[PDB]
Amino acid sequence: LERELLVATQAVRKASLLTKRIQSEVISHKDSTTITKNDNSPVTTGDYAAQTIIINAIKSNFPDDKVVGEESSSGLSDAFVSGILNEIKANDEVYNKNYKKDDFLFTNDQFPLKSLEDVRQIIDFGNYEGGRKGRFWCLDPIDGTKGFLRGEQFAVCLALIVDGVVQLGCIGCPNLVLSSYGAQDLKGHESFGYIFRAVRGLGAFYSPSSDAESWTKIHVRHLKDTKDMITLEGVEKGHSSHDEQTAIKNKLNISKSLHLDSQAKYCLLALGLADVYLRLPIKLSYQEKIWDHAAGNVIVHEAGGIHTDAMEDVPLDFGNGRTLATKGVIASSGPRELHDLVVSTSCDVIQSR
Ligand SMILES: Nc1ncnc2c1ncn2[C@@H]1O[C@H](COP(=O)(O)O)[C@@H](O)[C@H]1O
Numbered sequence: 001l002e003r004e005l006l007v008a009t010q011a012v013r014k015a016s017l018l019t020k021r022i023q024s025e026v027i028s029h030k031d032s033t034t035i036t037k038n039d040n041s042p043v044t045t046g047d048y049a050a051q052t053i054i055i056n057a058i059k060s061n062f063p064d065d066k067v068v069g070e071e072s073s074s075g076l077s078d079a080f081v082s083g084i085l086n087e088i089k090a091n092d093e094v095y096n097k098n099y100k101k102d103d104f105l106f107t108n109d110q111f112p113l114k115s116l117e118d119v120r121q122i123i124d125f126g127n128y129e130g131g132r133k134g135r136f137w138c139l140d141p142i143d144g145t146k147g148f149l150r151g152e153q154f155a156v157c158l159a160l161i162v163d164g165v166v167q168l169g170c171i172g173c174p175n176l177v178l179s180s181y182g183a184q185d186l187k188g189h190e191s192f193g194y195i196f197r198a199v200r201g202l203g204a205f206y207s208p209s210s211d212a213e214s215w216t217k218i219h220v221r222h223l224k225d226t227k228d229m230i231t232l233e234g235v236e237k238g239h240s241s242h243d244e245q246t247a248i249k250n251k252l253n254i255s256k257s258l259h260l261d262s263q264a265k266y267c268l269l270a271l272g273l274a275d276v277y278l279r280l281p282i283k284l285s286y287q288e289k290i291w292d293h294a295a296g297n298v299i300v301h302e303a304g305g306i307h308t309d310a311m312e313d314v315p316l317d318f319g320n321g322r323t324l325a326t327k328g329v330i331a332s333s334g335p336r337e338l339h340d341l342v343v344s345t346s347c348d349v350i351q352s353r
Pocket residue numbers: 143144145147233234235236238239240260261262263281282286289292
């Protein structure tokens with residue numbers, strides 16, 4: 001999967017810079033850069049620009065490839081689309097001065113990414129429904145859009161699924177400063193953060209996004225007692241059952257928690273800076289989206305961790321379409337005894353409502 005990893009990495013890299021660069025402007029013009037979707041969730045110029053860069057890179061390199069992307073261009077006005085295009089081109093002017101990759105194409109004759117109709121066409125390639133067989137890309141162009149809009153953590157996530165199993169993942173964390181989580185930062189991290197990646201069977205690695213050439217292997221840690229561990233949880237109260245997560249902590253004597261938006265959580269897990277990622281469901285009717293977890297799935301696995309749902313303690317199934325059929329998500333450092341204690345506690349807490 002050599003070409004695929006290169007494409008994915010460069011695609012995320014470029015989109016990581018664009019999204020980092022525009023975060024403030026988006027926030028400041030949060031009347032004209034942001035749209036509300038049918039569930040009231042937000043989507044910005046940044047989300048679409050990221051999606052455009054990424055899909056255009058995939059399609060330039062792999063013309064027939066299928067993509068499951070959360071966004072679609074229907075309804076986007078020309079003015080809105082012109083703003084997406086302008087951000088891509090401004091980003092290119094900065095990006096090409098320092099980060100061009102030799103012998104790598106983001107655009108070609110078939111997909112030149114020059115017009116508003118090109119933009120629309122590329123966005124609209126994200127409409128695959130996934131499923132059990134064959135190869136397809138899974139993208140969350142801005143992962144944790146509320147984190148983005150709060151000026152806090154967000155990520156840019158891409159994965160390749162083949163026959164329902166995630167084979168490759170790439171997560172850009174443009175605002176992730178390791179010194180905030182008790183770790184050292186690497187040279188070059190300050191321009192646009194870090195990129196994390198893994199291929200099934202080949203290990204998990206990271207690099208500053210500005211580098212993306214020299215890769216450092218990462219692995220979860222293994223603390224022996226739960227009273228020393230650290231949880232990872234989201235910030236948004238509506239995205240997970242915080243009170244039930246607290247019950248879990250209290251039962252396990254955990255007194256250290258980190259809250260942040262996006263799959264950057266899986267990256268901190270995989271680096272060994274925390275131990276248990278909790279994502280219990282508030283409502284059992286919710287079906288988790290694959291693009292919120294697929295990149296992280298393979299990164300955690302290759303880092304030596306475990307990833308299941310939050311009730312049954314079964315592995316997540318990335319072949320069910322756009323959603324996970326199970327309820328909630330729990331990831332940890334493992335071993336299995338730690339993981340199972342956590343998930344069984346979650347199960348019991350939920351059942352006791
Ligand atoms: N009710 C919900 N339960 C779980 N996840 C949700 C819910 N509503 C939205 N989300 C997802 O939360 C993701 C961001 O996760 P996070 O930053 O970890 O809180 C988004 O990309 C949404 O798809």
